[PDB]
DNA sequence: GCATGTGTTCTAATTAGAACGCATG
DNA sequence: GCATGTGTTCTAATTAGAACGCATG
């Protein structure tokens, strides 16, 4: 465990994320009071950057694709006291038959948050305080899962949103984040059931919803694929400000670029649970500062 | 890393991955007679190696890193031995002080891709370099090296292209190329013959 | 021209709003500080009503299309202090160039408005205050005008937009509204320049915009069909939010029912401008309550 | 509205637009053959006819609409001459307190459309009557009204199938079609003979 | 003197929707 | 002991975009 720093020795945070998407990792941090330093983004898809910038006004500095990010890029950027990311998990989850593992495809990309975090780690002699987190899909196959673990020394902790959230969504966690294995509580504003998520007029008939992913399908429950809303006495699928209210961003935070609602699903359906997130960032406003 | 008076060059120590060296470095005389563990370690499936493994294995002079030799004899992916043979390079370093040298090498024998290539080259922090091996009425031998080993990349070896390289792609199937790759390391280490 | 009210007399007022598309009456009058006692909405269209119901939390009374209105339903409904309507123009602007007239396809619902104000008038000996106001494009033959005119037994004020908002839209006003023939003053609150209206990161090519209609051939500008935004370097058109501000419409307003691109141009494309509707409903502060 | 008796009855004062039934009425007597002006006002264009004007003619004991009869002579849209009777009819109407009897009657010579016949009942207020207006040997005259006279809404006629009668239209390409339907306002005012 | 428009329309992109997939509590 | 899934796909409905239009200050 890292030392305890005294208030007025808190610097703010310096951050580093790797395949940052809609900028969760951003906006928890300020949901949670820190002070951002400094916030580097490594993201290639032009609607996240979009949301990134807009809903955030420039505070994050966007570095294009990850694997154009030198050494010299990182002590340049640096020093980050933070290293986060979720590396793309179309080739690694078992909603896809013809995942491609870690080695081939997308799930290389993993490797590349690997490599960026040596570099981006103190050198030995400096005790300061380094922070990193690593999120990917629980159903991927037991050597990936194992590899990943190899390559960053340490075993995941499983998080699901459904704890703190309407939704179905079970993901690993590794990192050395204080406190990761604690068991996560539910806040007041946690909208715990899918009612709370949905807009007036509308009737929920769950209390949870499955597993939302980047495609319109997911919204159907179960076998059934029943859709999940009613209003005016009819049948409805999920709306994209609800989408949001489930997956804990703020209201109207996808609402960029003229995207419509595919595009908001798809940035939605890969993105982080922002309670799940709050959780795992919370223990860090004892080592920064914060207003 | 500056030259070494004679006296002072201690045997070798390398750690060989996926690949066992032992005849090929014992012929230039980098290992003493025999029964002696030190000079080399050799592993073949390193899945379930961890830092703690390398590190009680003895503090190593050389990592070396190679590709299985070209046929269809690959369970893993072209890329798997290059990602571990990163992981445990870390493990194998020594303090950021140098009590010694610290030497680190990694072959392939034409199996990776252009994909696979330019990863190398960005996780290695080098371009690789090209060892042909013909006397014109042979075409045989030919691998790419990345190494920080000084004069690996010091002289101009023979320049050829690589539209001449997959045409050396027979892929149906050392002693001169492999040992000249191999040589300016016993300028640092101990001469046994 | 009206009795003045004294303010301990002022009861809260009751509107008839036909052809209320997203609901722009309601919005102006709840905005003002007009306490809103009945509010009856004849719309047609799902998603307009979506947004009218979502954004207003039910407050709005839909009965539907206005031809099925009996003159039972007038005095069972009221009594209306306001009769509000925009017919649809899609028959009647030039912009159509098969436009069909007053009187065939779709110019013939303004009758509609007419008769069902007639129907919602004090009868003889009701000294009580009752307004009404009528909106129409300009381009409009000059027949349709002169009968529009004649059935109304008044001649409109034009107001166009552009003296308070950031786009041209000219529109002709029928009514009985107090001050309609004012001079129309820009508010401080007023977005009057297209850059007052883009999100972060966005240049503004124009000070001011054509006419937007619900297609998006409106938003390329003159003969050109210049793009009116600069992103990163980079032509673009307008976005979602963006018209909304330009309207005067709340950011997010139109974000209901999945809307993409295309469903919310639509919607706003047909709509009012806000701060031209909030100078004409503004001197009926002094004949209702408010808070 | 009751029955008003034989000496308190007034002659008619009949507002006549876009047909001229001048003839119809002084031949079944409800207009003297000698009268100073008239107390009929016929218009034909009603475009730029304002409220003032028809209050300006003095008041009006019957309002009558009519479409132009089947041909070319159709210069305006049909439902141009339902909105514009509707229009003025309410121009008409006297003070709240009604001192006479006040009647209207519009009537359609097979011109308008369903669209535009629902339209007609709804500011109208009422679904029409048609007049069969056919012997067994002649099947002529035909026509639709809308009217407050209660006679004109009070009792049977003979019932006709409009299949039959939506081809009748185009057969095409008086008295007892309209006139007979005129006759019960006899009784509420004067009869000239 | 000539650019403008609360739209209809037809065509070219473009996305919606569900079929598909099976190891695993 | 069956239901689940940060997705690929292929087709069928989708919209997107620009041509069209001209009386007129
Ligand atoms: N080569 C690359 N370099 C940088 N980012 C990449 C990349 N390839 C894919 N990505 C991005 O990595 C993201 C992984 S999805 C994870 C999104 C993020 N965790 C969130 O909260 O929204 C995707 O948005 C994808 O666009
Ligand atoms: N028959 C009918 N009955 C009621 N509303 C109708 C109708 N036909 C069309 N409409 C609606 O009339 C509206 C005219 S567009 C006017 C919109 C409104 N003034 C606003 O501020 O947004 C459209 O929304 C259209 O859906
Ligand atoms: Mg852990
Ligand atoms: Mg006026």
Redesign the interface.
């Given at each position: 465990l890292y030392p305890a720093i005294p208030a007025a020795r808190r610097r703010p945070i310096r951050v580093l994320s790797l395949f940052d998407g809609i900028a969760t990792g951003y906006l928890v941090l300020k949901e949670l009071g820190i002070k951002v330093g400094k916030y580097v983004a490594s993201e290639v898809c032009e609607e996240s950057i979009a949301v990134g910038?807009?809903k955030h006004?420039?505070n994050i500095k966007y570095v294009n694709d990850v694997?154009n990010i030198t050494?010299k890029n990182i002590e340049e950027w640096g020093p980050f006291d933070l290293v986060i990311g979720g590396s793309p998990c179309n080739d690694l989850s078992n909603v896809n038959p013809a995942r491609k593992?870690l080695?081939?495809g997308t799930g290389?990309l993993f490797?590349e948050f690997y490599?960026l975090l040596?570099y981006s780690r103190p050198?030995?002699?400096d005790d300061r305080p380094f922070f990193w987190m690593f999120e990917n899909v629980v159903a991927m196959k037991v050597?990936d899962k194992?590899?990943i673990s190899?390559?960053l020394?340490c075993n995941p902790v499983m998080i699901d949103a459904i704890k703190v959230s309407a939704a179905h969504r079970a993901r690993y966690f590794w990192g050395n984040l204080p406190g990761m294995n604690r068991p996560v509580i539910a806040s007041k504003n946690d909208k715990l059931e899918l009612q709370d998520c949905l807009?007036?007029?509308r009737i929920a008939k769950l209390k949870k919803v499955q597993t939302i992913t980047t495609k319109s399908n997911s919204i159907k429950q179960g076998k059934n694929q029943l859709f999940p809303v009613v209003m005016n006495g009819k049948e409805d699928?999920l709306?994209?400000?609800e989408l949001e209210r489930i997956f804990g961003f703020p209201?109207?935070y996808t609402?960029?670029?003229?995207?419509?609602?595919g595009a908001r699903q798809k940035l939605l359906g890969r993105s982080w649970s922002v309670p799940v997130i709050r959780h795992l960032f919370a223990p860090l406003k004892d080592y920064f500062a914060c207003e | 890393f500056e030259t070494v008076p004679v006296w002072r060059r201690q045997p070798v120590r390398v750690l060989s991955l996926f690949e066992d060296i032992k005849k090929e470095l014992t012929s230039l005389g980098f290992l003493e007679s025999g029964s002696d563990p030190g000079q080399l370690k050799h592993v073949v499936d390193v899945?379930?190696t961890?830092?703690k493994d390398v590190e009680e294995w003895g503090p190593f002079d050389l990592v070396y890193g190679a590709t299985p030799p070209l046929g269809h004899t690959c369970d893993?992916?072209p890329?798997?031995y290059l990602?571990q043979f990163?992981?445990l390079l870390?493990y194998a370093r020594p303090?950021?002080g140098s009590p010694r040298p610290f030497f680190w090498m990694f072959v392939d024998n034409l199996v990776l891709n252009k994909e696979d290539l330019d990863?190398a080259s960005?996780?290695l922090?080098m371009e690789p370099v090209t060892i042909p091996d013909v006397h014109g009425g042979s075409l045989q031998n030919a691998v790419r090296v990345w190494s920080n080993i000084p004069a690996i990349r010091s002289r101009h070896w023979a320049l050829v292209s690589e539209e001449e390289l997959s045409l050396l792609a027979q892929n149906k199937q050392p002693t001169k190329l492999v040992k000249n790759c191999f040589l300016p390391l016993r300028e640092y280490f101990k001469y046994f013959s």
């Open positions: 910038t807009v006004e420039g694997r050494k593992g080695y081939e290389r490797f490599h040596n050198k030995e002699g050597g194992r590899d190899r390559f020394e807009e007036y007029n699928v709306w994209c400000t209201v109207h609402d960029v670029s003229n995207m419509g609602r | 899945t379930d961890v830092r893993r992916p890329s798997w990602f990163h992981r870390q303090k950021p990863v960005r996780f922090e």
